[PDB]
N, C-alpha and C. Protein backbone atom coordinates (compact mmCIF):
# COMPACT_ATOMS: atom_id res chain seq x y z
N UNK A 1 -20.45 4.66 1.23
CA UNK A 1 -21.04 6.20 1.75
C UNK A 1 -20.58 7.05 0.11
N UNK A 2 -21.24 8.01 0.38
CA UNK A 2 -21.53 9.09 -1.28
C UNK A 2 -20.87 10.55 -0.85
N UNK A 3 -19.69 10.30 -0.07
CA UNK A 3 -19.17 11.83 0.15
C UNK A 3 -17.48 11.85 -0.33
N UNK A 4 -17.72 13.00 -0.62
CA UNK A 4 -16.39 13.42 -1.31
C UNK A 4 -16.43 14.82 -2.38
N UNK A 5 -16.35 16.05 -1.66
CA UNK A 5 -16.36 17.21 -2.21
C UNK A 5 -15.30 18.28 -1.75
N UNK A 6 -14.94 18.92 -2.76
CA UNK A 6 -13.17 19.94 -2.34
C UNK A 6 -13.38 20.96 -3.38
N UNK A 7 -13.39 22.11 -2.84
CA UNK A 7 -12.97 23.31 -3.53
C UNK A 7 -12.14 23.91 -3.48
N UNK A 8 -11.09 23.35 -3.69
CA UNK A 8 -9.38 24.04 -3.83
C UNK A 8 -8.74 23.32 -4.82
N UNK A 9 -7.95 24.04 -5.82
CA UNK A 9 -7.35 23.72 -6.82
C UNK A 9 -5.66 24.42 -6.93
N UNK A 10 -4.74 23.60 -7.29
CA UNK A 10 -3.56 23.97 -7.27
C UNK A 10 -3.38 24.97 -8.42
N UNK A 11 -2.39 26.29 -7.89
CA UNK A 11 -2.31 26.92 -8.79
C UNK A 11 -0.77 26.75 -9.33
N UNK A 12 -0.85 26.85 -10.78
CA UNK A 12 -0.09 27.19 -11.56
C UNK A 12 0.93 25.72 -11.51
N UNK A 13 -0.30 24.21 -10.91
CA UNK A 13 0.38 23.31 -10.69
C UNK A 13 -0.19 22.19 -10.73
N UNK A 14 0.28 21.36 -11.27
CA UNK A 14 -0.37 19.68 -11.56
C UNK A 14 0.26 18.59 -10.53
N UNK A 15 -0.59 17.77 -10.02
CA UNK A 15 -0.59 16.70 -8.75
C UNK A 15 -0.44 15.50 -9.51
N UNK A 16 0.33 14.33 -9.68
CA UNK A 16 0.79 13.28 -9.88
C UNK A 16 -0.66 12.53 -10.11
N UNK A 17 -0.78 11.45 -10.55
CA UNK A 17 -1.75 10.56 -11.34
C UNK A 17 -1.77 9.64 -9.78
N UNK A 18 -3.27 9.24 -9.41
CA UNK A 18 -3.46 8.27 -8.09
C UNK A 18 -3.10 7.16 -8.33
N UNK A 19 -2.15 6.47 -7.40
CA UNK A 19 -1.93 5.09 -7.32
C UNK A 19 -2.87 3.99 -7.35
N UNK A 20 -2.51 2.81 -7.92
CA UNK A 20 -3.05 1.88 -7.81
C UNK A 20 -2.98 1.10 -6.58
N UNK A 21 -4.06 0.08 -6.56
CA UNK A 21 -4.39 -0.53 -5.47
C UNK A 21 -3.74 -2.03 -5.38
N UNK A 22 -2.82 -2.36 -4.16
CA UNK A 22 -1.70 -3.46 -4.44
C UNK A 22 -2.51 -4.99 -4.17
N UNK A 23 -1.99 -5.75 -4.84
CA UNK A 23 -2.63 -6.78 -5.51
C UNK A 23 -2.25 -7.97 -4.25
N UNK A 24 -3.02 -8.98 -3.94
CA UNK A 24 -2.80 -10.02 -2.79
C UNK A 24 -2.30 -11.31 -3.46
N UNK A 25 -1.17 -11.57 -3.41
CA UNK A 25 -0.73 -12.98 -3.86
C UNK A 25 -0.85 -14.23 -2.80
N UNK A 26 0.01 -14.12 -1.70
CA UNK A 26 -0.23 -15.26 -0.88
C UNK A 26 -0.93 -14.70 0.09
N UNK A 27 -1.88 -15.63 0.65
CA UNK A 27 -2.75 -15.36 1.79
C UNK A 27 -2.90 -16.37 2.69
N UNK A 28 -2.17 -16.00 3.79
CA UNK A 28 -2.29 -17.03 5.25
C UNK A 28 -2.28 -16.67 6.07
N UNK A 29 -3.25 -17.53 7.06
CA UNK A 29 -3.98 -17.10 8.13
C UNK A 29 -3.05 -16.43 9.21
N UNK A 30 -1.75 -16.25 9.00
CA UNK A 30 -1.31 -15.62 9.82
C UNK A 30 -0.65 -14.33 9.34
N UNK A 31 -0.75 -13.99 8.26
CA UNK A 31 -0.07 -12.89 7.52
C UNK A 31 -0.72 -12.94 6.24
N UNK A 32 -0.34 -11.81 5.41
CA UNK A 32 -0.84 -11.32 3.97
C UNK A 32 0.26 -10.88 2.94
N UNK A 33 0.08 -11.67 1.88
CA UNK A 33 1.39 -10.99 1.03
C UNK A 33 0.53 -10.01 0.30
N UNK A 34 1.64 -9.14 -0.02
CA UNK A 34 0.98 -7.83 -0.75
C UNK A 34 2.26 -7.71 -1.89
N UNK A 35 1.53 -7.36 -2.93
CA UNK A 35 2.70 -6.51 -4.22
C UNK A 35 2.50 -5.50 -5.15
N UNK A 36 2.62 -4.53 -5.12
CA UNK A 36 2.28 -3.28 -5.97
C UNK A 36 3.24 -3.09 -7.05
N UNK A 37 4.16 -4.07 -7.62
CA UNK A 37 4.49 -3.79 -8.80
C UNK A 37 3.93 -3.69 -9.62
N UNK A 38 3.28 -3.00 -10.40
CA UNK A 38 2.01 -2.72 -11.18
C UNK A 38 2.04 -1.54 -11.45
N UNK A 39 2.84 -0.77 -10.82
CA UNK A 39 2.70 0.97 -10.91
C UNK A 39 4.27 1.15 -11.59
N UNK A 40 5.28 1.04 -10.67
CA UNK A 40 6.40 1.69 -11.11
C UNK A 40 7.12 0.49 -12.20
N UNK A 41 5.98 -0.10 -13.07
CA UNK A 41 6.45 -0.91 -14.14
C UNK A 41 7.60 -0.41 -14.68
N UNK A 42 7.61 0.61 -15.54
CA UNK A 42 8.32 1.72 -16.31
C UNK A 42 9.61 1.30 -16.02
N UNK A 43 10.70 1.35 -16.85
CA UNK A 43 12.35 0.75 -16.29
C UNK A 43 12.84 1.75 -15.22
N UNK A 44 13.18 1.64 -14.78
CA UNK A 44 14.35 2.30 -13.79
C UNK A 44 14.95 3.44 -14.06
N UNK A 45 14.48 4.41 -15.71
CA UNK A 45 15.26 5.53 -15.94
C UNK A 45 15.82 6.01 -14.74
N UNK A 46 16.99 6.15 -14.61
CA UNK A 46 17.85 7.26 -14.11
C UNK A 46 18.33 5.94 -13.05
N UNK A 47 19.23 7.10 -11.61
CA UNK A 47 19.45 6.28 -10.80
C UNK A 47 18.68 5.89 -9.59
N UNK A 48 18.93 5.03 -8.66
CA UNK A 48 18.16 4.47 -7.50
C UNK A 48 17.40 5.90 -6.70
N UNK A 49 17.95 6.98 -6.92
CA UNK A 49 17.75 8.25 -6.36
C UNK A 49 16.57 8.67 -6.96
N UNK A 50 16.65 8.43 -7.66
CA UNK A 50 15.21 8.84 -8.95
C UNK A 50 13.77 8.20 -8.95
N UNK A 51 14.01 7.31 -7.73
CA UNK A 51 12.70 6.45 -7.32
C UNK A 51 11.92 6.79 -6.71
N UNK A 52 10.69 6.70 -6.86
CA UNK A 52 9.44 6.76 -5.95
C UNK A 52 9.49 6.35 -4.73
N UNK A 53 8.72 6.92 -3.79
CA UNK A 53 8.62 6.14 -2.48
C UNK A 53 7.04 5.59 -2.28
N UNK A 54 7.35 4.16 -1.34
CA UNK A 54 5.78 3.84 -1.39
C UNK A 54 5.43 3.40 -0.13
N UNK A 55 4.81 3.95 1.14
CA UNK A 55 3.88 4.30 1.96
C UNK A 55 3.02 3.33 2.41
N UNK A 56 3.10 2.27 3.19
CA UNK A 56 1.59 1.44 3.37
C UNK A 56 1.37 1.64 4.61
N UNK A 57 -0.24 1.65 4.78
CA UNK A 57 -1.17 1.87 5.89
C UNK A 57 -2.20 1.27 6.29
N UNK A 58 -2.18 1.29 7.46
CA UNK A 58 -3.53 0.24 7.79
C UNK A 58 -4.31 0.79 8.99
N UNK A 59 -5.75 0.70 8.84
CA UNK A 59 -6.68 1.55 9.38
C UNK A 59 -7.03 0.30 10.77
N UNK A 60 -7.39 0.98 12.01
CA UNK A 60 -7.22 0.39 12.85
C UNK A 60 -9.39 0.30 13.62
N UNK A 61 -9.65 -1.06 13.68
CA UNK A 61 -11.27 -1.23 14.00
C UNK A 61 -11.40 -0.67 15.71
N UNK A 62 -10.48 -0.16 16.41
CA UNK A 62 -10.51 0.23 17.77
C UNK A 62 -10.27 1.40 17.61
N UNK A 63 -9.22 1.77 16.86
CA UNK A 63 -9.01 3.54 16.57
C UNK A 63 -9.27 4.35 15.66
N UNK A 64 -10.17 3.57 14.95
CA UNK A 64 -10.53 3.94 13.74
C UNK A 64 -9.55 5.10 12.87
N UNK A 65 -8.31 5.12 13.18
CA UNK A 65 -7.31 5.53 12.92
C UNK A 65 -6.39 4.78 11.81
N UNK A 66 -5.91 5.30 10.81
CA UNK A 66 -4.78 4.38 9.64
C UNK A 66 -3.27 4.91 10.78
N UNK A 67 -2.29 3.80 10.06
CA UNK A 67 -1.19 3.70 10.47
C UNK A 67 0.03 3.21 9.46
N UNK A 68 0.99 3.96 9.29
CA UNK A 68 2.24 3.77 8.30
C UNK A 68 2.33 2.05 8.69
N UNK A 69 1.62 0.88 8.36
CA UNK A 69 2.74 -0.40 8.78
C UNK A 69 3.97 -0.35 8.09
N UNK A 70 4.26 -0.15 6.90
CA UNK A 70 5.61 -0.32 6.06
C UNK A 70 5.68 1.02 5.19
N UNK A 71 7.30 1.54 5.24
CA UNK A 71 7.48 2.70 4.47
C UNK A 71 9.05 2.38 3.93
N UNK A 72 9.15 2.62 2.78
CA UNK A 72 10.04 2.37 1.50
C UNK A 72 10.07 2.28 0.47
N UNK A 73 11.39 1.70 -0.58
CA UNK A 73 10.97 1.81 -1.94
C UNK A 73 10.48 0.34 -2.48
N UNK A 74 10.45 -0.53 -1.65
CA UNK A 74 10.02 -1.60 -2.02
C UNK A 74 8.63 -1.93 -2.51
N UNK A 75 8.47 -3.23 -3.61
CA UNK A 75 7.24 -3.01 -4.50
C UNK A 75 6.22 -4.08 -3.33
N UNK A 76 7.07 -4.63 -2.93
CA UNK A 76 6.34 -5.96 -2.17
C UNK A 76 6.17 -5.68 -0.49
N UNK A 77 5.05 -6.54 0.05
CA UNK A 77 5.04 -6.47 1.70
C UNK A 77 4.10 -7.40 2.19
N UNK A 78 4.24 -7.66 3.23
CA UNK A 78 3.78 -8.86 3.93
C UNK A 78 3.62 -8.24 5.36
N UNK A 79 1.91 -8.05 5.47
CA UNK A 79 1.46 -7.83 6.85
C UNK A 79 1.70 -8.91 7.90
N UNK A 80 2.73 -8.81 8.81
CA UNK A 80 2.97 -9.55 9.74
C UNK A 80 1.72 -9.62 11.22
N UNK A 81 1.79 -10.55 11.54
CA UNK A 81 0.79 -10.74 12.82
C UNK A 81 -0.73 -10.46 12.31
N UNK A 82 -1.27 -11.58 12.10
CA UNK A 82 -2.83 -11.15 11.76
C UNK A 82 -3.21 -12.42 12.39
N UNK A 83 -4.62 -12.62 12.42
CA UNK A 83 -5.55 -13.83 12.78
C UNK A 83 -6.58 -14.41 11.83
N UNK A 84 -6.56 -15.60 11.90
CA UNK A 84 -7.72 -16.01 10.65
C UNK A 84 -9.06 -15.73 10.73
N UNK A 85 -9.03 -15.64 9.55
CA UNK A 85 -10.65 -15.33 9.13
C UNK A 85 -10.64 -13.57 9.25
N UNK A 86 -9.72 -12.98 9.23
CA UNK A 86 -10.03 -11.59 9.82
C UNK A 86 -9.62 -10.50 8.46
N UNK A 87 -10.16 -9.73 8.55
CA UNK A 87 -10.29 -8.72 7.69
C UNK A 87 -9.00 -7.65 7.37
N UNK A 88 -8.50 -6.99 6.92
CA UNK A 88 -7.58 -6.17 7.21
C UNK A 88 -7.43 -4.96 5.94
N UNK A 89 -7.62 -3.56 6.15
CA UNK A 89 -7.31 -2.53 5.14
C UNK A 89 -6.23 -1.94 5.34
N UNK A 90 -5.34 -1.61 3.89
CA UNK A 90 -4.49 -1.19 3.53
C UNK A 90 -4.56 -0.01 2.34
N UNK A 91 -3.66 0.99 2.69
CA UNK A 91 -3.82 2.06 1.55
C UNK A 91 -2.35 2.35 1.20
N UNK A 92 -2.06 2.56 -0.24
CA UNK A 92 -1.01 2.50 -0.56
C UNK A 92 -0.71 4.12 -1.04
N UNK A 93 0.19 4.65 -0.71
CA UNK A 93 0.77 5.72 -0.85
C UNK A 93 1.91 6.08 -1.72
N UNK A 94 2.06 7.06 -2.85
CA UNK A 94 3.37 7.35 -3.25
C UNK A 94 3.42 8.93 -3.26
N UNK A 95 4.55 9.00 -3.61
CA UNK A 95 5.22 10.42 -3.58
C UNK A 95 6.47 10.88 -4.60
N UNK A 96 6.14 11.36 -5.74
CA UNK A 96 7.01 11.73 -7.00
C UNK A 96 8.26 12.09 -6.50
N UNK A 97 9.22 12.44 -7.34
CA UNK A 97 10.61 12.64 -7.02
C UNK A 97 10.59 14.19 -6.79
N UNK A 98 9.73 14.87 -7.17
CA UNK A 98 9.75 16.37 -7.31
C UNK A 98 9.18 16.47 -5.71
N UNK A 99 8.08 16.00 -5.64
CA UNK A 99 7.16 16.37 -4.52
C UNK A 99 5.93 15.83 -3.99
N UNK A 100 5.34 15.68 -5.43
CA UNK A 100 3.81 15.42 -5.33
C UNK A 100 3.59 14.06 -4.71
N UNK A 101 2.73 13.92 -4.15
CA UNK A 101 2.32 12.20 -3.69
C UNK A 101 0.42 12.15 -3.67
N UNK A 102 0.02 10.89 -3.63
CA UNK A 102 -1.22 10.47 -3.88
C UNK A 102 -1.44 9.43 -2.91
N UNK A 103 -2.64 9.13 -2.97
CA UNK A 103 -3.00 7.88 -2.30
C UNK A 103 -3.83 6.79 -2.95
N UNK A 104 -3.51 5.40 -2.62
CA UNK A 104 -4.33 4.52 -3.62
C UNK A 104 -5.79 4.21 -2.42
N UNK A 105 -6.58 3.53 -3.49
CA UNK A 105 -7.87 3.11 -3.00
C UNK A 105 -8.24 1.87 -1.58
N UNK A 106 -8.29 2.08 -0.50
CA UNK A 106 -8.39 1.00 0.37
C UNK A 106 -8.79 -0.35 0.04
N UNK A 107 -7.68 -1.17 0.32
CA UNK A 107 -8.03 -2.54 -0.11
C UNK A 107 -8.19 -3.51 1.17
N UNK A 108 -9.33 -3.74 1.03
CA UNK A 108 -9.58 -4.76 2.57
C UNK A 108 -9.46 -6.29 1.80
N UNK A 109 -8.58 -7.38 2.91
CA UNK A 109 -8.77 -8.38 2.32
C UNK A 109 -8.52 -9.45 3.41
N UNK A 110 -9.73 -10.13 3.78
CA UNK A 110 -9.41 -11.30 4.92
C UNK A 110 -8.41 -12.66 4.66
N UNK A 111 -7.86 -13.00 5.57
CA UNK A 111 -6.61 -13.79 5.76
C UNK A 111 -7.66 -15.31 5.37
N UNK A 112 -6.74 -16.37 5.50
CA UNK A 112 -7.30 -17.48 5.54
C UNK A 112 -7.60 -18.05 6.99
N UNK A 113 -8.41 -19.46 6.81
CA UNK A 113 -8.89 -19.91 8.09
C UNK A 113 -7.52 -20.91 8.51
N UNK A 114 -6.96 -21.07 9.81
CA UNK A 114 -6.13 -21.73 10.80
C UNK A 114 -6.08 -23.16 10.22
N UNK A 115 -5.01 -23.53 9.88
CA UNK A 115 -5.08 -24.86 8.59
C UNK A 115 -4.03 -25.74 9.90
N UNK A 116 -2.53 -25.35 10.29
CA UNK A 116 -1.71 -26.16 11.10
C UNK A 116 -0.54 -25.39 10.96
N UNK A 117 0.58 -26.25 11.69
CA UNK A 117 1.81 -25.61 11.86
C UNK A 117 2.53 -25.43 10.79
N UNK A 118 3.71 -25.48 10.70
CA UNK A 118 4.60 -25.15 9.59
C UNK A 118 5.72 -26.42 9.92
N UNK A 119 6.23 -26.56 10.87
CA UNK A 119 7.46 -27.73 11.05
C UNK A 119 6.20 -28.94 11.43
N UNK A 120 7.03 -30.04 10.73
CA UNK A 120 6.09 -31.41 10.92
C UNK A 120 7.34 -32.11 10.37
């Protein structure tokens, strides 16, 4: 789609840059591995309290709505409970230690096909 217009600007204030999309390492037909440790690379300058928050969400094909599947400071995440040969969209959100916050570009990923059980 070609939609994106806004006529509002922050007064004497500048928001933080937009976060990058999370990468997909391990791909299972029952789950999906995710790791966005490519943004908060910079040393952990200061105490843990001086860290940024990372909230992950997912869109619903039936509810056409998003839902925070994960919320924390971790850089990795694995969407549990998935189906084989199924696509899933996830958005990475971040909020500066001051208040500002941005959103990452939706990342659609399709799991793998059912191979077999684990215990054998």
